[PDB]
Amino acid sequence: SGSANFAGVEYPLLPLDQHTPLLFQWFERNPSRFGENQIPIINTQQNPYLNNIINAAIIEKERTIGVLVDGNFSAGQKKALAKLEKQYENIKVIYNSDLDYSMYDKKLSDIYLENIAKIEAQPANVRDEYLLGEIKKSLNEVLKNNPEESLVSSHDKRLGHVRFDFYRNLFLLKGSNAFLEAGKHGCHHLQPGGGCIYLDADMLLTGKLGTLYLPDGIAVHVSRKGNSMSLENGIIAVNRSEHPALKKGLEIMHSKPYGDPYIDGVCGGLRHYFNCSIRHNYEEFCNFIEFKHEHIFMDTSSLTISSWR
Ligand SMILES: O=c1ccn([C@@H]2O[C@H](COP(=O)(O)OP(=O)(O)O)[C@@H](O)[C@H]2O)c(=O)[nH]1
Ligand SMILES: CC(=O)N[C@@H]1[C@@H](O)[C@H](O)[C@@H](CO)O[C@@H]1O
Ligand SMILES: [Mn+2]
Structure with a gap:
């Protein structure tokens, strides 16, 4: 199968076979902008995301979507x-509220209290006195209004990219398991502990993806703007649930x-997992970890307008 090297470690290229499901995400914070019986997924002339999902489902007839x-x-x-699911056999709509994320949760008061203890152990002359005060204010705010506030509940409140970015990571930690948890029947060759290929709805398919070969079975989008490149979460491919790189990102969140x-949760988890330290070469890590496929036309929203910016 081969392998690829980064930072003196050789990582086998693990396969994501052609039955690895694709995952699209649409979190709607104002669904009343759609018809009361309309599919609540944007499908404008500028952002034809519903149509893009349909088309990828038509190309990948045999793949779970x-x-x-x-x-x-x-x-x-x-x-x-539901009518959509019955039109396209391989499309499986999963309601985020139908999934149990508590196994990834942690109380904010515990996070805050853990950091306060570390920072307060440093003497006043060297400690980050500003940060310590910000954490104390945050903890105090939690204890005054919602002492059981946790990572999940806190992000539940923060509508927008921060919240759907958050649940994107948690869903990918469930991997194929999420389809089984949600009770989606007839997902061909979907196995517990199996993986998932997340794609932004503006990542246009133009042909079948076939089997992927990724370093330790993970890759992410690497965007290029001007002369720069950055790790992105517009594409996240894992060959298994609980991928240790996404788990490390959750640990950082904790x-x-x-x-x-x-x-x-994404960039940080990847970089620690592969030991791309601030001393290492970021451009070398990007090339190593990049998700590449000639049959995906990537981030087409940049050609028109973002759906949320
Ligand atoms: O109201 C929104 C806007 C965006 N998204 C998600 O965010 C992704 C990125 O959208 P887009 O490409 O328009 O944003 P950008 O590339 O500018 O970050 C979409 O595919 C959706 O999965 C969402 O769930 N709800
Ligand atoms: C092409 C790409 O990487 N898009 C992502 C988008 O999915 C994500 O929600 C947003 C906020 O983190 O960052 C990026 O714009
Ligand atoms: Mn985009």
Whole structure:
């Protein structure tokens, strides 16, 4: 199968076979902008994401296609989604609220208290006095209004990319298991502990993906703007659930007072897992870890307009 090297460690290229499900995500924070019986997934002329999901489902006829949705949909919008599932056998709509994420959760007061103890152990002359005060204010705010506030409940409140970025990582930790948890029947060759290929709805398929070969079975989008490249979470491919790199990102989220689902849960998890230290070469890590496929036209929203920026 081969292997690829980074930072003196050789990682086998593990296969994601052609039955690894694709995952699209659509979190709608104002579903009343859609018809009461319309499919609550944007499908404008500028952002034809529903059509893009349909088309990928038509190309990958044999592949399971998850659509993780969330929002306060009307009963009729949910029936519309159900009608979608019956039009395209391989499309499986999963309601985020139907999934149990508590095994990944942690109380904010415990995160805060853990950081306070470490920082307070440093004497006043060298400690980050500003940060310590910010964490104390955060903890105090939690204890005054919602002492059982946790990572999950806290992100539940923060509508926007921060929240759907957060659940994207948690769903990928479940991997194929999420389809089984959600009770989606007839997912061909889907196995517990199996993986998943997440794609932004503007990542256009133009042909079958076939089998992927990724270093330790993971790869992510690497975006290029001007002359720069950055790790991105617009594509996340894992060959298994609980991928140790995404788990490390969750661990970072569990120890950092202000963990970002993208910066820490994805970029941070990948870099620690592969030991891409601030001393190592970031461009070398990007090339090593990049998700590449000639049959995906990537981040097409940048050609028109973002759906949320
Ligand atoms: O209201 C929104 C906007 C975006 N997204 C998700 O965010 C992804 C990225 O969307 P887009 O490409 O428009 O944003 P950008 O590339 O500018 O970050 C989409 O595919 C969806 O999965 C979402 O769930 N709800
Ligand atoms: C092409 C790409 O990487 N898009 C991602 C998007 O999916 C994500 O939600 C957003 C916020 O973290 O960052 C990036 O724009
Ligand atoms: Mn985009």
